[PDB]
Every structure is written in C-alpha cells, then in structure tokens.
Design a protein around this ligand. Structure first.
Ligand SMILES: Nc1ncnc2c1ncn2[C@@H]1O[C@H](COP(=O)(O)OP(=O)(O)O)[C@@H](O)[C@H]1O
Ligand SMILES: Nc1ncnc2c1ncn2[C@@H]1O[C@H](COP(=O)(O)OP(=O)(O)O)[C@@H](O)[C@H]1O
Ligand code: ALF
Ligand code: ALF
Ligand SMILES: [Zn+2]
Ligand SMILES: [Zn+2]
Lengths: 686, 686
RNA sequence: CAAGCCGAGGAGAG
RNA sequence: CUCUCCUCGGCUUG
RNA sequence: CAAGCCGAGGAGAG
RNA sequence: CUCUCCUCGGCUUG
C-alpha cells in the first residue's frame, strides 16, 4: 500500500496518465508498483465519475494464478471487484460479461485475442479495447514480430492511426486505454552495433506505444544497498583422458559405417554428423532402400550417446543404448509371438557382443569426469560454508541431463551428509522425446522448494522467469548460455547476501565466449537506453510514428499473401517406412473433430499389433501403441463414443501418388495439401 | 616455452624493443618465436607496472582460429587473458571493450580497420593504436600498395611523423607500439634488376617500419639438418597425335564461323580467340543483332572445351558441351511448355548431328594423354616406394580440373591397389563460374588429411599458405606457375625426408621458363637481402624516412581525386540481351537495404519463368532462377519480410537512354551512375 | 492422469 | 532457408 | 545450407 | 589500360 522513493520516481509519470514502460531489476517490487498504480487510477477515475476497468496480461497460467491469489486480490478486494482468468478455468465461457461484471481482470493475452477475433469475424458478443481504461503488460520484452502481445498492440496502433485521421475529419475520436509495460531487460535482439541496439529499443517502444522508459537514475545507492549482485565465477575444465569407452564407441561406429560402405564427410560426435545421418535416413526411407535407414538411425543413436558421454557419466549413455536395444528386441519377439532381416540381426549381435565390456568400462573411477568433479567441489564448498543456510539452482540444457544429475546426487552420501536435498524440474511440452512434467507437479515442487524440505533445483529454461522462487544463495550454469535476457534473469536470482553465480564449462566449447558476448550486449543495451532517455521529444515522436506505420503496413503486405491444396484422397497411398508396402489409401482415412485422423476398416485391424502404455506402466492400459510387422510404429489407440479406433501419425509413413509418384513425407497432417472427410458412421454399420 | 639457438638469435633484437621483420623457412617455428616474444614482453611490462596489450593480425579466419585454439591459448591462458576474433563470431559487436577486457588479441585486420574508421568518422566508441603495446603481423609480405595491412601501417607512419614534428614543438609525443612482422619470402614484385629488388625490399621495410630483417646467418648447418629441402624434378611431355577429336572440333568451329561469314584474325584454342569472341558478343548484344551473340557464345564454349582437352581427358570437354546444350534444350522446352529462331535450331542440330561420333572418339585409349600418363607413373612410383608411408599434394590451376583429376583417379583400380585415397579442395568465392566450397568443408577435409584416411590432395592456390597441413612426401605442380612466393611456399611443404618436388608440363607451353624465372628471382632476392642487412644505419634510416614520406604524400594526392552520377531513374530502360525488348524502366526498380535490386510490379510478374535451384537439387527450392522467353537469364528469387520478390542482375540487360541512347552495359550496379530509391511499401499496397 | 491438434518464442549447427 | 535442442500458449477425445 | 552487395591481392593473354 | 583465371576479406536477406 506504500511505495519506496525509487519506485515512486518511476511510477509518477504513469500516475500522470502517460503510457510508459518500466525496467527494474528482479525482485525490486514491480508488482507493488502495478497494484498501487491500478488503485490510484481507479480512485482517480471514480472521483470524476467515469468508467474504470483495468486488465493485466501475462504469458503463463501459473503467473496469473499467483498474482491474483497473492498480490492483487488481497489488496483491492476491500474496494474493487477482482477476477483472474486462465485456460484452466471455466469462467472464460462468456468473457464479455466477465468484463462488465468485474472491474479488475488478470488473464493471458490469448483469451482477449480470441474475444477480439470472435467480435471481428465471429457472431459472438465479442469485446473491444475501448471497454478498458488501463492495460498492464508484464514481461513486455516479448512484444515482438508476431507474438500475441504484438498483435494486440498492432490493433491498438491501428485504432490510434484511425483516431489521428479522424482528428481532422469527424470528431470525437475513439478513446484508448493507458498502457503500462513491465520488464527488467528488453534486450537487444540480433544487434551487432550500438546503432542496432538503439533501433531495437526504438522498435520496442513503438510497438508498446511508450512515452519513455523511466529507468532508475537518482536513488541508485539505495537500490544497490537493497538488492545486491552476486560475484561472478568461471569454472574451466580440461581433459586428455577417458579414452577406452569413447574409442570403443568410435570403432563400433566405424564398423557399422564400413558395413554399408558409407564414409561420411564429417567426423563423429558433432551436430553435423547428426544432420548428415538424418538426411541419409530420410533419403533411404524415401527410396525404400533398407539396410541404410536402420543403419542411419543406429548411427544417430550412437552420436547422441557420445554427446551424452561428452557431458555426463558413461552409464547414462549405456542406459540409453540398452533401453533402445531392449525395446527393439521386445518388439521383435512380440511380433514373432519365420523370416528375419539380416541387417537387424548383425546390428543386434554387434551390440550384444560388447555389452559386457561396455558395462565394465563404464564403471571406472579412474576417469569419471572433470566437470562433474568441479561441480561436486563447488556444491560442497558452498553448502559446507552455509552451515545449513543455503539454497541453490542449477540450469542445464536437457531433461535426461537433469535426471542423471539428480540420481548421481542421490548416489553420493556426501551430499546427504552436508545436508543437500535435490530435486529436478522440466517443462510441460510433449515434443521433447521425453515424457513432460505436468503443471500440478511444477507448482508442487515449487511449493516444497519454498518450504525448504528441498534444498536445490536442477531446472531447464523453465525457471528463469514466471516462477515464484525464494531467493537462493548459489546459481550454477552447467554449460548453458542462451542470451542476455536469460542471463540477467538467472543472475537476479542470487539475492541473499553471500550468494554467488558460477558458470561451469570446458575449454573445447565456446560457452565462455557466448557468456562474454552476452555481457557485451548488456553494456550495449545500457548505453542505448541511456542515450534514448535523453532524446528530444519531437524526433522521438516522429520516429515512433514512422516505426508504427512501417510495422502496420508491412503486416498488411505480409497478410496479403496469406490468402493461399487440391483434394484427391484416392490419389495417394501410404507405405510403411521400413517395409515399403501398401498400408492404406486416402479414402479409408477419416477425421474426427477435424483434428484426429483414424482408419476404421476390418482388414486394417489385422495389419498391426498393440502394446502396453509405458507411461501408465510406471492400473489400466487405454492408449496402446501401434507397431508394424517390421517393428515400425504407426500410432496409438483412441476411444471415441466408447469405440476403439486407431490414430495414425503421418511421420511414420511415406506418401505415394498415382500421377508421377515423387514420394514425399510431410511430418504433420496440416502440411499435407489434400483434405479428408469427416467421420460418417454409415460406412461399416447398419 | 623454450627456443632453439637459431630462433633465439633472430628473436633477441625484438626482445630489446626494436620493431623488426623475421623471414624464416616454412615450418621452422615462427609462431613459437611469436608466442615467446609476447610472453617476454608482457612479463617485462608487468615488471615496470605498465599497461601491456598485444594484438596479432592475420588474413584468414581459419588461421586465427587455429592459432588461438592450438598455439596461443594453451601457453598463456595460465598467466594472461587471451581472445581470438574473426568475422564468423559475435564478439566483434563491441570491439573497444573487447580490447580493454582482454590483454592478448588475435584477429583479422579488417576488424581493427573498421574500428579505426568508426572512431575517425563514426560516432561509436572507437579504438586507437595507442591502446596497444605490441602488434604482430603474420604474412607481412602482403603489406603493399593499399592492402589493409598497408592502410594500418600508413596510419602508424602518419602518427610517427606527427610525433617527429611534435618533438621540437610541444612534448610529450604520442607513444607507439612495437611492430613484429613474420614471413618466409617477402618477394621482389615486378623486379627486372638487382637494384629493383633492393628497392622493393626497402619499400617493404619502410612500409612495416623495420629496423632490420634478421635472417639466419650463423646456425645455417643446424637449420639445414632439421629442415631439409626436397629434390626438384621436371617432367616434360610431348605429342604429335590425338588428331580425330580435335580436328572434328576445329571443323565444326569452321562450319559455325562460316555460317556467320566471320573469319577471326586469330587462331583456335588461344586466349586471344576467347577475347575476340567476347568482344564480338558484346558488340552484337549492344547492337541488338542476334545470330551473332549466340554464335560468339557457342564459339567461346568450344574454345573452352578445346583448352580443357589440351589439359585433360576428352570426356571432360564432352561433358561440358552436353551440360550446356542439355540446359539450353531444357530451357527452350520449359518456355514452350509457337515461333522458333532458326539460329538456335541449326546450332542445336549441328551439335546433335555429331554427339554420338564425338562420344565414340572420346573413348579411345590409343591416344589418351601424355601428361596424364606421366603423372600416373610419378604417383605410382612414389606410392609404391613409400610402403604405405606417403602423402601428396597436387597444385592445379582450375576447379573443374580438380574434379576431373579426382574422378579419373577413382576410375582406376591401380591407385586403390597401391593404397591411394585422393580428395579435392577449392576456394570459397562465388565468382568462379562454379559452386564454391564452404569453410566448414575446407576445415573438415583438412582435418581428415591430417588424420590420414585421405592420402593426397588436389588443391588450387588455397593450399600454399594459411592452412595447417601435415608434411607431405610428394609435391606436384600440374602446369601451374604463379610467382616466387607461391613457389617457395609450395616447396616448403616437402618435409619428411625422401620427399620430392616435381613440375609436370609440356614443351609448347612456357611453364618451365616461368619456373626458371622464379628461381632467378629467388637468388636475386637473396642477394638483395644480403646487401641490405649490411647497410649503414644512417643511410638506411634516411631512405626509409624518404620512402615513408613519399608513400604518405602520394596516398594523400591520390585520395584528393577520389572525392568524385546524375540521378535520372526514369531516363533509362532495360532491354533483354538476346531479344531486344522493353523489360522495365528505372522507376519500377527499388532497392532493399541499399544493396538488393528488386522489381515488384504486377505486369512484370508475367514476363519471366521460374526454374528449380540446381545447387539444392544435388528438400526445398527457395532461390529459383529467372529466365526469359528467349531463354535468357535475368536473375533469381529472394524473400524479404516473407515476401517473394525477384532480384535482377545488371549484366543480363542493356541500358537505353532517352537523350541520345549510346546503349551501354555496366557489369554491376555500382558502376551505374544513377541512383535508385529505397523500397516503399505504399506502392501497390493498401 | 493418458492421447491427439494448432500456433508462438529463444539457442546452437549447417 | 534447413536440422536439432529448449520453452510457452490455446483446443479436442478420453 | 541458399541468394545477393562491396572491396583487396596474384598469374596469364592482349 | 582491357579481358580471362585464381585467391581473400567484410556486410546483408534468408
Ligand atoms: N513497499 C515495500 N516495502 C518493503 N518490501 C517490499 C515492498 N514492496 C515489495 N517488497 C518486497 O519485494 C518482494 C516482491 O517483489 P516482486 O514485485 O514480486 O518482484 P518483481 O518486481 O521482480 O516481480 C516481496 O517479497 C517484498 O518483500
Ligand atoms: N622449441 C621447439 N622444439 C622442437 N620443435 C619445435 C619447437 N618449436 C616448434 N617446433 C616444431 O615446429 C612446428 C611448428 O611450426 P610453426 O611455427 O607452426 O611453422 P611456421 O613457423 O612455418 O608457421 C611444430 O610441429 C613443432 O614440432
Ligand atoms: F518480475 Al520478477 F523477479 F523480475 F518476479
Ligand atoms: F607460417 Al608457415 F609453414 F611458413 F605455417
Ligand atoms: Zn513395416
Ligand atoms: Zn529475352
């Protein structure tokens, strides 16, 4: 209910009715400023007897829920009506009179965008920006290119231009709400010179229609006293050992490569090798030539294992290989539950003729890992010095890496002795080759991390922003560097004086250089903002108008082309990737809800096999996987109206046309230019 | 970390603070001397508590990356901060505080030149030479005329002259860094007498501000014992056969020539013929008279084929012709996808009425090639004598030649039997009529050549310098002689005792004489250096000062004229070269980023045809070629802001003016004196 | 809690 | 422009 | 990985 | 001074 002088100095111009942006460090009380501004604006509008509505837009459901339940509701419930929406709630069914029913709204931009789309094209009641008097946008740095924030503000700018036109012609013009953006680091984007950073900042300002930035410039000492930066540390690790297992991997790779008389132009263990393997497997699948598709797939698996070994223990890679190979053996045995294919035979024999030696080599404390030893030392020093008063975050690139680090931590008793309780955290996307984490589990782990029964976190890029996390004492980056904004957000985590920020990496990689470049970009952005804050109003307004007009017109020009697919379902046929054979046509495939592709015919039922659901394995089995006779996966099982149907994935097939047959693969249904009919139950019924 | 006595004797004067040059053979440890000198200089400056910064300038990104990752970083990382920059990295965004952040810098001269230009004219922070204490320039022989090295050292000399002036007037003068140049052969340039070589060496010294040369003069025996020169061999090949195919080429050439009643003043198969053909085609295109432009173009193609045959197999020339003719037929058929032009008709018929006989003649082991037989014998003898312990390099003039040699090698089983694994290597410039090689592929082939799975290389002038190559046993020059410096660099490749250097050529050409002249220049340069090393300091300094003053003043005088183009876009019109017709005007042409010329109008869209991208052909097609109705190419396709636009090449057009119309062709946009407007999306929009 | 569909952003390699 | 990795949002069948 | 722009150096022929 | 061949660097659109 009360603000600090450094908060007040930045908030004042907003209190005067000027739309602006506010860039403050992490944890400096931006939400406090937002709530105070909303209260003041509502009171001032009520004094004049004018309609007052305020809407807050965020990009995460968890953020909206937290802000409503902890910050906004407890402060304005006594005076105004507050509501918080998201995609997980049932209030969004009728949004327009959600709006007129309540005064303060917190939500995600997509809901309001959908309402606008319904109004402009749909027959629903719809909603307009004029219904609002104040719009708050947190994490405003995301307003770029064609994000939802950018679309909303594009509509706002179009309305502003229409009002400017109407100024000379009929009056009055359409009123527009005030705009308040919140952030900590707007970034520089792809900037290689100071002028590029200046242009990027001006573009952000024009997109958000900002009068100025209002960065702290007077109470710097008080702010620094309060929020204090950690000390930065670099850990560099080098090695010229760990030969045996890697050499064994390399020589088996050479054996498999010379089996197919294919010597790639690239070396082993690099992304270029993976790309070449993907290209070769794709070409082999298109041509239907076996003995190369599987070879490329196994080479890709070996490359992934080598990368994993380059980052973490050898047992992790061994586990990866054994999981893949055991799955293949189980699939083959289930199919055989006879003619074999020699290629899979020699591949399996090669893997199993050296499984024991690989396992023996993997267990060798002689050369385990330099980076892991450095991380062990860092964690132990920090925690032993904190006398049980420390908390830590570790940012890592991948998910399997998080699992490996967590289990590794639990296998060592020193972490428990010092009092270390670690947990992992990942995203919620089903497009990462691994079972994602659910929102409930994320909130739940965050809650226990807040309590303290969990000491340290092993998190992917989820944890930089949008999460309510108590200040930690140690921040670690395990070979992960993305950009300056993520760097700043991770750095701001290290409050709790006597906290430190460390980046651990090796010499071969260029991670340190990327971190340095991010630092350079930080200073470039600071200088750009410093210059921009002192620019003359006239030229500032001129350039903002120019940028807004250019953005709107280029959006118009780009949308012009988007108007643009012949429908010949019977023209195409589907072939299994490994065993090229006629699977089905485009006539037997039907669509449910225009979204689910399913084939429901008698003969097709006997062309596949059903397995158990591994996700539910670790009860009942509902969505079983679908595998081919060769062992190739086609899709899964679904139930519609209580009826069991198969759902297919286009990426598991090859398309053949009857006109000229340039067989092609589309990776998803939408890219397929042909249409499919909606389900008709008359076929194979009554 | 430790030096040899011959290295020490040359390094000592540098250790005393004297700027100098150092000329040593190839592979004698120049980088070792450089790193030791940098370490000693940094330590000595730190002893006196003085600012110390060292910058190394190179001319190739690969060289900088290699030097940083293999030589400098592993030796000074334990004491000093080392950084390596290039045009392929993101650290160059803010160079000045790259400089103050780090102590040791490795980079390409262009970056520092750009920083200086920004400081002197731009508003950026900028950089000055005074910020450095030591400047190392490798491959210093390139510092001549107006290379980047020469510009930097011109600035250095101007600063020195200003300091000399200020000596009598206000003091102190501006400090300057020490200068250390590295090379192996500074060369003689265009020298025809000993005095000319002396003048050239003095000019190089003055440009680099060198106290002396410091060439090895005492430990000659130890150096010779270590690095040993190969034995030089000349292979001369003569022939009075291979008539049929060449005579058939000549008689078809005569037929086409007498079709147009044009008997050139020159003979067939010489550069003078190609020049005359280019002049005739240019005049015909300017006059718009068809039946001569295409005739000249086909005559030029036949001349190129005859040259190729003069160097390599006949099938290579046959492939060249069939590629061109098949492309023409495909273009015509795609256009027709009707009125024909009799000229192309009889040309095509003439080509196709003898395709089979040409193919039959090309396959004839009776007379294949004398030079190729000699090369076969040389390679076989070397490799059979090396019992699988040899590596080889072959320097060839052109790229198609490298491809032909490589494929020829793979067609013969004797090379495989002896254990020969060959690979090719070319440059990375898109101005050689052939798709260039990329940097990644160059590094990658070099890596495998280092490993050994690739035995011999077929390389153009890329491989003489700037590449990390393990010593080879055989060096071959296949009819290629450029200058003494390239000769010395190629010769130095032949370490690995029992290595040999051979030049293969015929009697008609004057290649042997050019090689002999290069040897003469080598001895002339040696004598010039020997005299210069013994010159009296006073006259040496006097002449160096005179040369520096003369160079700076002539640069001033030349820059004076460079101050100097009316803008009448609507004045000109563009005509297709083959079919002279109104294509467009200078008003419908717009410019993107001041660099890309594009025409975006409705009527223009229907005036051209789109083909597939051959580079991507051997997926998706993004930059398709643009062809005319007559089959003439105009340009390609580009995408800006997601919008498909055509990009035109001026060399495919003829310019017509409305005042007096002296139609002219410019070969590139910059030479065109008129300006063009920047893209404005308002036209044909909204 | 499981399956599927669409769209968006960031990094790296080519 | 392509591939990979990572994140986010909305929508359906259960 | 594709396209385009600018500039520099070396050789040969004229 | 012109033409061709070869090499290099920097910068944009993707
Ligand atoms: N007026 C205030 N006086 C004292 N502490 C405050 C005040 N406002 C906020 N804080 C502190 O700041 C924290 C809230 O910061 P918050 O706004 O959530 O961070 P951010 O601005 O980075 O989102 C609270 O934990 C609280 O301790
Ligand atoms: N002090 C030394 N003792 C022994 N060998 C050395 C020494 N310094 C360099 N070398 C040899 O010289 C090579 C490095 O030469 P380098 O300086 O790269 O060649 P150049 O001077 O032609 O660039 C290495 O392969 C190494 O074997
Ligand atoms: F918005 Al913050 F830490 F910067 F919650
Ligand atoms: F500089 Al060298 F061989 F002469 F690398
Ligand atoms: Zn199958
Ligand atoms: Zn034409």
């Amino acid at each position: 209910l009360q603000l600090r002088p450094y908060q007040m100095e930045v908030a004042q111009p907003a209190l005067d009715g000027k739309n602006i942006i506010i860039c403050l460090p992490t944890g400096s009380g931006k939400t406090r400023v937002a709530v105070y501004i909303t209260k003041d604006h509502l009171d001032k509008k009520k004094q004049a007897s004018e309609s007052g509505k305020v809407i807050v837009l965020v990009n995460k459901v968890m953020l909206a829920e937290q802000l409503f339940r902890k910050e906004f509701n407890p402060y304005l419930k006594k005076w105004y009506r507050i509501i918080g929406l998201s995609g997980d709630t049932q209030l969004k069914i009728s949004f327009p009179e959600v709006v007129k029913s309540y005064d303060v709204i917190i939500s995600t931009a997509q809901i309001l965008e959908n309402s606008l789309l319904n109004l402009e094209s749909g027959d629903d009641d719809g909603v307009q920006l004029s219904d609002f008097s104040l719009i708050i946008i947190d994490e405003c740095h995301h307003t770029n290119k064609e994000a939802v924030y950018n679309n909303i503000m594009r509509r706002y700018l179009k309305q502003k231009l229409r009002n400017n036109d109407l100024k000379k012609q009929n009056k009055p013009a359409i009123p527009l709400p005030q705009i308040l953006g919140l952030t900590a680091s707007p970034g520089v984007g792809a900037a290689k010179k100071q002028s590029e950073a200046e242009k990027h900042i001006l573009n952000i300002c024009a997109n958000l229609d900002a009068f100025t930035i209002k960065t702290v410039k007077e109470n710097l000492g008080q702010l620094k006293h309060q929020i204090k930066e950690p000390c930065k540390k670099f850990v560099i690790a080098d090695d010229t050992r760990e030969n045996p297992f890697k050499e064994k991997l390399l020589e088996i790779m050479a054996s498999i490569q010379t089996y197919c008389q294919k010597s790639p132009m690239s070396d082993f263990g690099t992304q270029h090798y993976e790309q070449w393997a993907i290209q070769m497997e794709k070409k082999a699948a298109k041509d239907g030539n076996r003995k190369d598709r599987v070879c490329a797939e196994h080479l890709r698996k070996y490359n992934e294992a080598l990368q994993i070994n380059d980052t973490i223990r050898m047992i992790d890679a061994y586990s990866h290989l054994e999981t893949f190979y055991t799955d293949e053996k189980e699939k083959k045995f289930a199919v055989l539950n006879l003619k074999l294919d020699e290629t899979d035979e020699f591949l399996m024999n090669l893997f199993f003729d050296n499984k024991k030696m690989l396992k023996k080599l993997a267990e060798n404390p002689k050369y385990e890992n330099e980076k892991l030893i450095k991380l062990r030392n860092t964690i132990l020093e920090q925690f032993t010095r904190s006398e049980e008063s420390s908390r830590g975050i570790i940012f890592t690139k991948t998910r399997q890496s998080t699992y490996a680090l967590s289990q590794w931590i639990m296998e060592n008793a020193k972490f428990a002795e010092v009092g270390v309780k670690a947990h992992h955290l990942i995203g919620a996307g089903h497009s990462s080759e691994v079972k994602p984490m659910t929102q409930t589990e994320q909130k739940e782990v965050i809650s226990k991390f807040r309590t303290g029964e969990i000491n340290l976190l092993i998190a992917t890029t989820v944890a930089e922003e949008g999460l309510d996390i108590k200040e930690c004492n140690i921040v670690i980056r395990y070979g992960l560097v993305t950009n300056e904004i993520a760097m700043v957000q991770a750095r701001g985590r290290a409050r709790a004086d006597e906290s430190t920020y460390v980046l651990v990496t090796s010499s071969g990689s260029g991670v340190t250089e990327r971190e340095i470049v991010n630092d350079f970009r930080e200073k470039m952005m600071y200088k750009a903002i410093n210059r921009v804050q002192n620019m003359k109003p006239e030229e500032y307004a001129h350039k903002i108008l120019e940028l807004q007009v250019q953005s709107i017109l280029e959006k118009k020009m780009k949308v012009k082309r988007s108007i643009a697919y012949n429908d010949n379902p019977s023209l195409i046929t589907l072939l299994c990737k490994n065993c090229s054979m006629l699977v089905c046509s485009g006539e037997n495939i039907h669509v449910v809800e225009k979204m689910h592709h399913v084939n429901m015919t008698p003969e097709f039922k006997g062309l596949y096999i059903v397995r158990e659901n591994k996700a539910l394995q670790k009860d009942y089995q509902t969505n079983g996987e679908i595998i081919c006779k060769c062992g190739q996966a086609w899709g899964t099982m679904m139930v519609h109206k209580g009826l069991d149907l198969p759902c297919l994935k286009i990426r598991n097939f090859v398309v053949n046309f009857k006109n000229n047959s340039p067989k092609k693969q589309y990776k998803k249904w939408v890219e397929l230019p042909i249409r499919f009919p909606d389900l008709d139950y008359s076929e194979y019924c009554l």
